């Protein structure tokens, strides 16, 4: 099932019982994130392009689940992920991030996140388990991946390209050479992966990681 906004710029698709994928368009470019419905509120993985879209996304999910968004995990310091940091902070939403992401955010003129995530961080919201992992430099110097151990679902972010993507994207701030090693670190860490969510594009499987390594070759 998929719910959208009149405009069409924002949609939320269900992956399973308490896991949904949110997608917003930034001529227009899509960006994926996750919406986690827990017994203690909603938790998002990444916000949106800007404050207008981010606020809209929040209003949408809060209305649907009749709960508040309590936390957001920021996977890197680019607009498509930290675009609405100001909205989150004025709503009492905790914006988790690594210390590195926090400093790059400041440096990119964005209000900065908590900078609390370590290389390996395990968070539990109600009964929903979430693990954050920094695999090394790649698409960006600070990119991290998110893992849901109860579903073996991996949020790759922009470290992972979708099946039909033939372009790596903006590599001005990327570490192309290191990117491959970082993806290998993810593969070595998570042996049995089911679904993989790309920065943008359709949800796939481990094949997406191999596809990205192929592009980097
Ligand atoms: Zn990016």
Curated annotation (Swiss-Prot):
GO cellular component assignments: periplasmic space
Q: Residues that bind Zn(2+) 2, according to the entry?
A: 80, 158, 200
Q: Where substrate is bound, by residue?
A: 161, 170
The alphabetized UniProt keywords are: Antibiotic resistance, Hydrolase, Metal-binding, Periplasm, Signal, Zinc
A molecular-function term among this protein's GO annotations: beta-lactamase activity
Tell me the cofactor note.
Answer: Binds 2 Zn(2+) ions per subunit. The enzyme can also function with only 1 Zn(2+) ion.
Q: Its catalytic activity? A: a beta-lactam + H2O = a substituted beta-amino acid
Activity regulation, per record: Inhibited by captopril stereoisomers and iodoacetate. Also inhibited by chelating agents such as EDTA.
Indicate where this protein resides in the cell. Periplasm
Task: List, alphabetically, the InterPro entries matched.
Answer: BcII-like_MBL-B1 (IPR047917), Beta-lactamase_class-B_CS (IPR001018), Metallo-B-lactamas (IPR001279), NDM-1-like (IPR050855), RibonucZ/Hydroxyglut_hydro (IPR036866)
Q: Which cofactor does it need?
A: Zn(2+)
Give its E.C. classification number. Answer: 3.5.2.6
Q: Which domain of life is it from?
A: Bacteria
A single BP term in Gene Ontology:
antibiotic catabolic process
Q: Where does Zn(2+) 1 bind?
A: 76, 78, 139
* Major place of residence: periplasm
Pfam families linked to this entry: Lactamase_B (PF00753)
Q: What class of enzyme is it?
A: hydrolase
Give the UniProt family note.
Belongs to the metallo-beta-lactamase superfamily. Class-B beta-lactamase family.
What do we know about how this protein assembles, alone or with others? Monomer.
UniProt function note: Confers resistance to the different beta-lactams antibiotics (penicillin, cephalosporin and carbapenem) via the hydrolysis of the beta-lactam ring. Active on cephalosporin and penicillin.
Q: What is the protein's given name?
A: Metallo-beta-lactamase type 2
User: The organism's lineage?
Assistant: Bacteria, Bacillati, Bacillota, Bacilli, Bacillales
């Amino acid at each position: 099932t998929v719910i959208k906004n009149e405009t069409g710029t924002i949609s939320i698709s269900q992956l399973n019982k308490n896991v949904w994928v949110h997608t917003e368009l930034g001529e227009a470019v899509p960006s994926n994130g996750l919406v986690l419905n827990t017994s203690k509120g909603l938790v998002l993985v990444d916000s949106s392009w800007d404050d207008k879209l981010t606020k809209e996304l929040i209003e949408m999910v809060e209305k649907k689940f009749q709960k508040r968004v309590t936390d957001v995990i920021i996977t890197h310091a680019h607009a498509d992920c930290i675009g609405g940091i100001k909205t989150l902070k004025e709503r009492g939403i905790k914006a988790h991030s690594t210390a590195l992401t926090a400093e790059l955010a400041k440096k990119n003129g964005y209000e900065e996140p908590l900078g609390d995530l370590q290389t390996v961080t395990n968070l539990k919201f109600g009964n929903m388990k979430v693990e954050t992992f920094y695999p090394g430099k790649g698409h960006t110097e600070d990119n991290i991946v998110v893992w849901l151990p109860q579903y073996n679902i991996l949020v790759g972010g922009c470290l992972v390209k979708s099946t039909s993507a033939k372009d790596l994207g903006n590599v001005a701030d990327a570490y192309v050479n290191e990117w491959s090693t970082s993806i290998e670190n993810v593969l070595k860490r998570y042996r049995n992966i089911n679904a993989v969510v790309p920065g943008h594009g359709e949800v796939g499987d481990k094949g997406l990681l191999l596809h990205t390594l192929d592009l980097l070759k």
